[PDB]
């Protein structure tokens, strides 16, 4: 086409979606990771994770307001990945990299799994 | 912080949100612009438009599944702006610029209003 494009638009949209999450505006699901609860927007979760895409495209699960993750999932790892979904920034540290990589494999977040593998390979 | 950042994340999220819109997945509102209807995600509309942000943060309106816009709004202008919200690309043409600018002023999309003003000034 003959369109013009605003370079910062996608980043500005994501920043506003994170501001809605902060303020608990139009959040429509609670993700339970053992004793912890995380509120989020189903659309953002589906856009970032192959697992959530599969969950919320299922005719029965699309209607649930609570999703319980596998008990092996670490809440801190999930929290770091949820922040990444809404900000593009990943708080990857020596003390959390194994939990983050395991959570990203479960959630099917291939780019995160890729950077974790590279950082682990560099330490070996 | 000590975060790393994935450059293409925000663009990839927006591309996936547009794929959900295409496939009518988890769309939760219909915007009516005279005889036309447009399905969308309330969160994306709020992230892009000061008018939708005000509508869906209102305690009564946040619950509506149908929003009727002012009859003076041109459906083609709205369609071009909705595509911009989901893609960052604006289909601005000599034949639609006045309708697009008027719609962006109504929807409170300041960056769009800014580029329309500049393109109009260049023609004068």
């Amino acid at each position: 086409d003959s369109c013009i494009q605003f370079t910062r638009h996608a980043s500005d949209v994501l920043l506003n979606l994170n501001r809605l999450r902060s303020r608990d505006i139009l959040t429509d699901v609670v993700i339970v990771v053992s004793r912890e609860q995380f509120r989020a927007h189903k659309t953002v979760l589906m856009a970032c994770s192959g697992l959530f895409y599969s969950i919320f495209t299922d005719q029965l699960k699309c209607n649930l307001s609570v999703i319980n993750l596998d008990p092996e999932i670490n809440p801190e790892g999930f929290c770091i990945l949820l922040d990444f979904m809404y900000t593009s920034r990943l708080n990857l540290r020596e003390g959390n990299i194994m939990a983050v990589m395991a959570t990203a494999m479960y959630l099917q977040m291939e780019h995160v799994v890729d950077t974790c593998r590279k950082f682990i390979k560099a330490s070996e | 912080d000590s975060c790393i950042q994935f450059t293409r994340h925000a663009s990839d999220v927006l591309l996936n949100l547009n794929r959900l819109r295409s496939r009518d997945i988890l769309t939760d509102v219909v915007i009516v612009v005279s005889r036309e209807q447009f399905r969308a995600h309330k969160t994306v509309l709020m992230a892009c438009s000061g008018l939708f942000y005000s509508i869906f943060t209102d305690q009564l309106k946040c619950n509506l599944s149908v929003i009727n816009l002012d009859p003076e709004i041109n459906p083609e202008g709205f369609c071009i702006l909705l595509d911009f919200m989901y893609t960052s690309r604006l289909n601005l043409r000599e034949g639609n610029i006045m309708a697009v600018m008027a719609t962006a002023m109504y929807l409170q999309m300041e960056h769009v209003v800014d580029t329309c003003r500049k393109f109009i000034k260049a023609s004068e």
């Binding site: 369109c3 013009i4 494009q5 605003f6 370079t7 | 690309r89 604006l90 580029t115």
Partner: peptide, 4 residues
């Protein structure tokens, strides 16, 4: 704004 840019030409994409």
């Amino acid at each position: 704004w840019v030409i994409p």
